């Protein structure tokens, strides 16, 4: 497919979100779904458009599978690639580290020459700090199934609609 979606998940939430994103884009013919646990860093090179999904764990940490491939990311040349991000988190329980993983990954990948697309508004959430915020906007879609599951569906539909324009679809 033209879009490669790479996600990591601990309790399956991020995978379900990934599956809904693939669905909103039009299915397997448009988006390839890849679990980062089964991938090599070089797999990210095959796509000009990428969607990176990662839940924040252990108070501001990357999900373990993303943690394991993190240092390998340097071997991939992201110059020219457009990358979008999404993450699952808990704003009430982890108010000072809400969606940190998404921010850690965005900082890393953009420093490697990629272009970040898919900025999201922070107003629909209540948290103190997040490494995923730059100039009052989230660098990607923030999902909270723990406290705002009723908003997930429309958040995905709205974000994908916005992303289609960026990806030339
Ligand atoms: C031990 C533990 C630590 C967590 N730490 C954070 C955190 O630092 N920041 C955050 O936003 N959410 C945090 N969460 C919430 C998770 O990211 C959230 O439950 C998410 O849905 C998990 O997704 P997964 O099923 O894809 O792994 C934590 C959850 C648990 C159980």
CA of residue 132 to ligand 1 center, whole Å: 15
Q: Is the CB of 88 under 6 A from ligand 1?
A: yes
Q: Is the CB of 22 under 6 A from ligand 1?
A: no
**Nearest atom (ligand 1) to Cα of 11:** 25
Helix, strand, or coil (residue 163): helix
* 58 φ/ψ sector (left φ>0, alpha ψ -120 to 50, else beta): left
**Nearest atom (ligand 1) to Cα of 14:** 26
Q: Is the CB of 66 under 6 A from ligand 1?
A: no
The data reach a resolution, in angstroms, of 1.9
For residue 162 the two structure tokens come to: 């916005």
Q: What is the DSSP string of 27-69?
A: STTTEEEEEGGG--GGGGGG-SEEEEE--EETTTEE-HHHHHH
For residue 103 the two structure tokens come to: 């921010």
* 135 φ/ψ sector (left φ>0, alpha ψ -120 to 50, else beta): left
Helix, strand, or coil (residue 135): coil
On whether the CB atoms of residues 148 and 127 are closer than 8 A, the answer is: no
Way the structure was solved? X-ray
Q: Is the CB of 92 under 6 A from ligand 1?
A: no
CA atoms within 13 A on the CB side of 14: 34
Q: Which of 65, 10, 16, 58 is nearest to 41 (CA)?
A: 65
**Nearest atom (ligand 1) to Cα of 60:** 8
Q: Is the CB of 142 under 6 A from ligand 1?
A: no
Tell the CATH topology of 1-169. Rossmann fold (3.40.50)
CA of residue 66 to ligand 1 center, whole Å: 14
On whether the CB atoms of residues 79 and 111 are closer than 8 A, the answer is: no
Q: What is the DSSP string of 68-129?
A: HHGGGGGGS--TT-EEEEEEE--TTTTTTSTTHHHHHHHHHHHHTT-EE---EESTT---S-
Query: What is the number of other CB atoms lying within 10 angstroms of the CB of residue 116?
Result: 17
């Amino acid at each position: 497919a033209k879009i490669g979606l790479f996600y990591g998940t601990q309790t399956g939430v991020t995978q379900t979100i990934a599956e809904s994103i693939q669905q909103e884009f039009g299915g397997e013919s448009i988006v390839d779904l890849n679990d980062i646990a089964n991938a090599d860093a070089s797999d990210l090179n095959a796509y000009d458009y990428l969607i990176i999904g990662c839940p924040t764990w252990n108070v501001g940490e990357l999900q373990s599978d993303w943690e394991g491939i993190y240092d390998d990311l340097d071997s991939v040349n992201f110059q020219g690639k457009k990358v979008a991000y999404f993450g699952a988190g808990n704003q009430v329980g982890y108010s000072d580290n809400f969606q940190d993983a998404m921010g850690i990954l965005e900082e890393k990948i953009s420093s490697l020459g990629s272009q970040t697309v898919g900025y999201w508004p922070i107003e629909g959430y209540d948290f103190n700090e997040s490494k995923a915020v730059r100039n009052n906007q989230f660098v990607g879609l923030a999902i909270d199934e723990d406290n705002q599951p009723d908003l997930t569906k429309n958040r995905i539909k709205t974000w994908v609609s916005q992303l289609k324009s960026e990806f030339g679809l």
